[PDB]
Design a protein around this ligand. Sequence first.
Ligand SMILES: O=S(=O)(c1cccc2cnccc12)N1CCCN(Cc2ccccc2B(O)O)CC1
Ligand SMILES: [Cl-]
Lengths: 340, 18
Amino acid sequence: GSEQESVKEFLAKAKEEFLKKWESPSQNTAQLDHFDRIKTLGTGSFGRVMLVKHKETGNHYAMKILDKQKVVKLKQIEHTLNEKRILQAVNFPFLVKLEFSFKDNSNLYMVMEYVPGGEMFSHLRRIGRFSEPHARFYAAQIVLTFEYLHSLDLIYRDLKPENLLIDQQGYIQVTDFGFAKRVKGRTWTLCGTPEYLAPEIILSKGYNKAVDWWALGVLIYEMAAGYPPFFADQPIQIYEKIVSGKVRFPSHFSSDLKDLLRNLLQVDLTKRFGNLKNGVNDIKNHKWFATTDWIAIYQRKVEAPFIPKFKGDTSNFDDYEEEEIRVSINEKCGKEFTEF
Amino acid sequence: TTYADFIASGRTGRRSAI
Ligand SMILES: O=S(=O)(c1cccc2cnccc12)N1CCCN(Cc2ccccc2B(O)O)CC1
Ligand SMILES: [Cl-]
């Protein structure tokens, strides 16, 4: 009741701050000609991410540029408005920080601190797999991040190595929040990425924050094995495996790791760790985490097992054709994005 | 091996949301 009461008090203040920012979001805190473009870091079906330099300060940022017309075409208005509203309201060491946002006739812009270490995904595929201490270090950060997000009644719903950055201290930054939803009870949308979907998302019953603990199990498995627990040529075949209740482990997994994963990759949501009476403490007190100093992880005082090569450098991102950023003379989709 | 089956699945690159 010292450590536990400190966390309760911390989370109560955190919720008060979150709700104030959620109710009165920041808007229009920069403009495009404050920035020079350097390089395209990523492309998607309705936007791009660009490395940019702030002209006055010289600071580097990742600028997410979303084409309003394409957002409307692909039915992503609510997700995009939600992502920005969440990002400007949350505050936690392992969440990316929104520095500026604004819009113009054509685009929405979210400007975030640049993290040159890139995605966990690339590092994992390059090295093959992480040792269990390395995986555990990242897993502990996700456990704490979900403890925070769930205390705000947010379900995260898109955990995967693609959405985790590794910063220059070797710690994680969670990137994407469009799918994050306020859920005190249950929700029903089929959304996420096939390999990481909990059975109850596939099966069309309502679901709750316990899906994030299932996804943690998938992430830990993929980090430690180099491949996810459920894979196949086509998503429908992946879904059949997920709901089956059967999983196999590499022979190099420790006994403690297998026991944790059997309890996270638990199809019966009423038996799944994270979702029992003692909540996240069943995970934090599990034998696999016995060596984890949870407070030291939160304070970023643990020496990271891996620090990306320090080189403005973009070597941890792929190369893309550089295309114009065109801003129309006509305002597009103004009413739809009024709150951005 | 299971790894070989993972490679054969074709889903070794970045994965999109559904
Ligand atoms: O480009 S990111 O790695 C990235 C995201 C956020 C902050 C960043 C700070 N420094 C470096 C990179 C950064 N990235 C991580 C997840 C992958 N998407 C894919 C994407 C690409 C284009 C448009 C949208 C999206 B989306 O997500 O919804 C792009 C964002
Ligand atoms: Cl890829």
